[PDB]
Amino acid sequence: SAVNQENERLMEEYERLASELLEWIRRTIPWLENRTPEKTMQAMQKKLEDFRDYRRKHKPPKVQEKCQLEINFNTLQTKLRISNRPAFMPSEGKMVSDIAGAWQRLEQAEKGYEEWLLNEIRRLERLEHLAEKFRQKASTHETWAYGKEQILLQKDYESASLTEVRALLRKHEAFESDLAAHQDRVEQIAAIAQELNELDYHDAVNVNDRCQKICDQWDRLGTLTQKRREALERMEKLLETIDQLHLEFAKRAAPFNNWMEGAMEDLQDMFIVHSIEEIQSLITAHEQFKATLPEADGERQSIMAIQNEVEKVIQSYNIRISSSNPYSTVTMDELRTKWDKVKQLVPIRDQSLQEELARQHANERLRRQFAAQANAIGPWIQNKMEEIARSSIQITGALEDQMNQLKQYEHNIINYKNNIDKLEGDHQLIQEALVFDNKHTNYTMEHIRVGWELLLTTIARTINEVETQILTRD
Amino acid sequence: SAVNQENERLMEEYERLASELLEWIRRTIPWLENRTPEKTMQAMQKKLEDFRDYRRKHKPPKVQEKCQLEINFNTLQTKLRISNRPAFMPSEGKMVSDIAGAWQRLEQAEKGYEEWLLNEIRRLERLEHLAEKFRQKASTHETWAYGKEQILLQKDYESASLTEVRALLRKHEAFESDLAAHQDRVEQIAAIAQELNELDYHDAVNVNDRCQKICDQWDRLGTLTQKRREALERMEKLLETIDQLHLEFAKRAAPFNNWMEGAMEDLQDMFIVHSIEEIQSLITAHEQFKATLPEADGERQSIMAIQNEVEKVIQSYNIRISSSNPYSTVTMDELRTKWDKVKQLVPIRDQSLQEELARQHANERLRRQFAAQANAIGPWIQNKMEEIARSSIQITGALEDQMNQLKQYEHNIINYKNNIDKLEGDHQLIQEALVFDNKHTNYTMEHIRVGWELLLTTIARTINEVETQILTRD
């Protein structure tokens, strides 16, 4: 029984060594069937080294310890066959058929533990980079649009001029180019939030919201930029059409104000004419002007229809600003009151022209009645002088027959005295009216005056000469 | 002596009647030789009626009274010839020869009294109308130019914009047309003062001055209007050339600010590449950008040379106004400090690109040394397994000759254990560097792991199988 005790200390070796690796195989099987991922990537990096130490340090001894127990069994069962001893049966379930099933399930548990950790850290690696690139991109574009909505809402242009509105439009033009450059920024952030949605980020709850808030603001900026452009282009086209009317207003306001201011001097301009044609020519030129009054009144209405159009523009489009012309110093009141003064002066000029026409007619009436008498008295005296000249020489030697004719001529002259007095009145009236230019007659009052003064001097002369010749002859 | 007393009462009649008309002829001769004109026209109008009453009322009796005394003489001297009485000789100088000389000088005094009064009132009439037309014209044009000189002096445009200066120029354009319409007004007043100078107005002393003052102001207005136009056209052409530079500034400021603001994101943009070509392609595109830095720096200098030109314009022409751009929100400081930030980020991007290139090179260095061992250990184990497979079947029936080869293969495997441990280190290092993509080899650590684990399991198996076959054969 010396060899009988050797087998007892070798069969308990297989029983103790089987429990040594079965207690290890039963403690690592729940760990190998874990497959529950961790949140951080660093945790899975350690979990791969935990599997690595198992694969290069704890599995190599157990691989050898699997067939080592099989080595001891395929020798111990040959020892109890040579000296034909009772065969060994292991306790509870520490048998060869049983241990093979534990390693068959352990090698079935790790049929993808390395491949699970690798493609979990492969996914985790992309999630960790995309998470920080999202925070980077969504903050640089978050901060860009701080205040962008409120500035787009500004209604400053409601009281701006065509200069400030065009300048505003060029500033707004530049912001549109600035906006365009960020389309690819929000396009990128939308795709980063989609890749972080597909890869299942732990905080994709707040990324779906933080990205939709940014993408929703972008929709607001697109429309707001076109709505402010719609208001700036409308304000630009309202002040542009107001300037077209303010330039066209000033264009015809000055020529008309110069014509009106000029016509006021000419309507009052004093004059003095001594010819009936001299006054007529003034009426000829004044009645020519009287004809260009509906012609210029039509122009006056047209010029006012242009400043009434600018008040209509501000009213219809409700863009309450100063309807004053910054080009012309000619007001609508000036064109109303100045015109009334010009129309008021026309009957004054007509009245003063016709009163001078009446004067020239009265002056010519006096010239005509003076010439009728002068061209009858003048030649009557020249013929009465020639009658006396012929009657004062030779004839019948009888003085008494020439004394009859001399006292007859004397009576002819007495009867004509009244007709001379007529001319003195009409002469006084011509010079009282301030006329001295008589074209119808050649004789002046003085030429008749001397003819009559000669006529009476030479009748009494030749009468006294015949009276002395009658006495100095007895 | 009854007829002797009749001649005494008839000779004293001629002596008394001669003194009656000689006292009249001597009182009217100084009046007839007056010819001293009066100031007013109304005074000469009366002076003509004074001559008229003399010509139609006081000369007609004296004409008859001249020859009436001659009638009495040429009868009285025939009476003292019939009854031969002493001839009559008039006292002092009341003789026939003497009275003829008084009337010869009286008719010589009035040889132009009517013609002097007529052409004095003819001249006076024009002087009286021209005097009131001068006062009318010189007051309407005096009042027109009240303040015209001071307004022309206004230096308001020194702080006006291109809008206000063009508008000012259109207002000034209108005043030039207003000025032109009054050239014929001052031309007329100059001719009225010349006609009042030729006709000798009593107050032509003050008309020569009052007209030269008005004509002197006109000379001032002509030059002043062209001097203010010279200043308005200069201000218009200075602000016009400043706007050409402010539009050209904004034109290239936004594209450059968008490029600069865009390049700042791309210089910091994070990335992760796992290929040596993946990193190379980034350096390819970054070094392309590094080449368009003198290209855009030249553009940056050109854009700044345009805002330095507007400061040069205000300085050279001394028209101190705001040199700020009302078109672009891009300041010169923005273009200086933003550029410095872009140049500061280039070595950061170069540093971070090259550090990742070093990583990719180190990762490929590890891939290459792992594949060199795997593509040598893998095929060595597959050839050691095939050697044992051939050595474990048939051969010499002697087990001891196969037991020699089995324990020889065993030594070959022991000597190779270190070479396997090498791969475990380099495998750990590849996954420690986060690499899993090895293209050079087909085998992973696990494929070598199972080959070695099979190799030791099947050496001890076939060794124990030969050991049982040596014992169960005696």
């Binding site: 000419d266 | 021209l130 009225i192």
Partner: peptide, 11 residues
């Protein structure tokens, strides 16, 4: 004698 008398300019 010269004429200084003016007439309004028709439009």
């Amino acid at each position: 004698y010269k004429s200084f008398n003016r007439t309004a300019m028709p439009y």
